[PDB]
Structure formats: structure tokens, C-alpha cells
């Protein structure tokens with residue numbers, strides 16, 4: 001492979017940071033951080049409660065498949081921030097990466113869209129996005145305008161997938177609002 005841009009690495013540090021914080025701000029995360037994070041997620045997103053019995057598997061698959069490239073790592077393995085960034089670099093080159101993001105996103109979307117409409121209102125999306133990202137200033141990023149480019153007042157599942165795929169893969173566009181799909185960037 002080539003090398004990721006500095007901007008893309010910053011985006012990946014932005015993915016990793018909340019997990020690092022969950023694990024005690026040690027600079028690394030473990031399988032246990034994600035297992036413990038199940039309860040935290042059920043409290044923050046009670047929309048996930050109807051599928052709470054699937055959460056431990058989701059955490060474990062996240063550790064093995066997303067964080068560690070499908071490899072079973074030793075008990076106690078400590079994945080560092082910089083390592084996650086390089087593992088994510090390999091991951092986004094996988095032929096099935098886009099599908100993996102969509103499948104994961106479907107698990108969240110089905111909790112917030114119980115009637116299976118395929119969309120939510122822009123105001124609902126704004127409140128939910130603030131909850132997801134913990135960025136109280138998410139609206140000012142422009143992301144809701146950039147997703148709803150025709151001003152329908154709706155945000156579709158596909159809108160959010162498009163923003164997220166840009167975030168996980170784009171190298172050089174540093175100003176587009178889709179940069180902020182996970183909230184304000186860390187250093």
C-alpha cells in the first residue's frame with residue numbers, strides 16, 4: 001500500500017479517541033474495553049435495548065474484525081492508537097469494507113427507525129447526531145445541509161452511509177462537512 005494522508009490519520013485518531021477514553025485514557029484499548037462498553041452503550045442509546053442480546057457479539061466482532069483485521073489476538077492484547085490507525089489503513093483497502101460499515105450501521109439504524117421507513121427527520125438526525133458524537137456543536141459543522149442537499153427535511157440511511165464512507169476513506173478534502181460525521185476532530 002501507499003501511505004495515508006496526515007488528515008486521514010487524524011480522522012482515525014478521532015475514531016479511536018472515545019474508545020481510549022472509555023478504557024481509562026491509557027493510550028491503548030483491549031477486548032475488555034469493548035465488552036464493558038456494551039452496558040455504557042445501552043445506557044446512552046436505549047434504542048439498542050431491543051437487540052441487547054446481540055451486543056456482546058457485536059463488541060467481540062468489532063475487536064476481532066474491525067480493530068484487529070480478523071485476527072484472534074492473545075488474551076490481554078493491547079491495541080495502541082497508532083496501531084489502530086495503521087490497521088484501519090489496511091481495513092479500508094479490503095473489498096468488503098464498504099459492506100462492513102453498512103452492516104454495522106444497519107444495527108444502529110434499526111433501533112432508531114423501528115417502522116423501517118429508511119429515513120428520519122433532519123431535526124431528529126441533529127439530536128441523534130449530537131448524542132452519537134458527543135459534539136454539542138454538530139449542527140454548525142454543516143453536515144445536515146450537506147447530507148440533505150435538496151432540503152427535503154429528511155435524512156436517509158443512505159445519506160448517513162455516504163457521509164460515513166467519505167469520512168473513513170477520503171484522503172485530501174479537509175473542508176467538506178462529511179469530515180465531521182463523528183464530531184469535531186481530535187489533534
Ligand SMILES: C=C1[C@@H](O)[C@@H]2O[C@]3(CC[C@H](/C=C/[C@@H](C)[C@@H]4CC(C)=C[C@@]5(O[C@H](C[C@@](C)(O)C(=O)O)CC[C@H]5O)O4)O3)CC[C@H]2O[C@@H]1[C@@H](O)C[C@H](C)[C@H]1O[C@@]2(CCCCO2)CC[C@H]1C
Pocket residue numbers: 034037038041045055056058059062101104105106107108109125126128129130132133143160163164180181182
Ligand atoms: C453510531 C454509529 C457509528 O459510531 C458506527 O461507527 C462504526 C465504525 C466503528 C463503530 C463500532 C463501534 C463498536 C465499538 C460498537 C460495539 C457495539 C456493542 C455495538 C456497535 O454499536 C455501534 C453504535 C454505538 C453508538 O454503540 C457506537 O459505539 O458507535 C454501531 C455498530 C454496533 O456493532 O458497535 O461502528 C460503523 C457503524 C456506525 O454506525 C453508526 C452510524 O451509522 C451513525 C450515523 C453516522 C449517524 O448519523 C448522524 C447524521 C450524521 C452525523 C452523525 O449523526 C445521525 C445519527 C446516526 C444515524
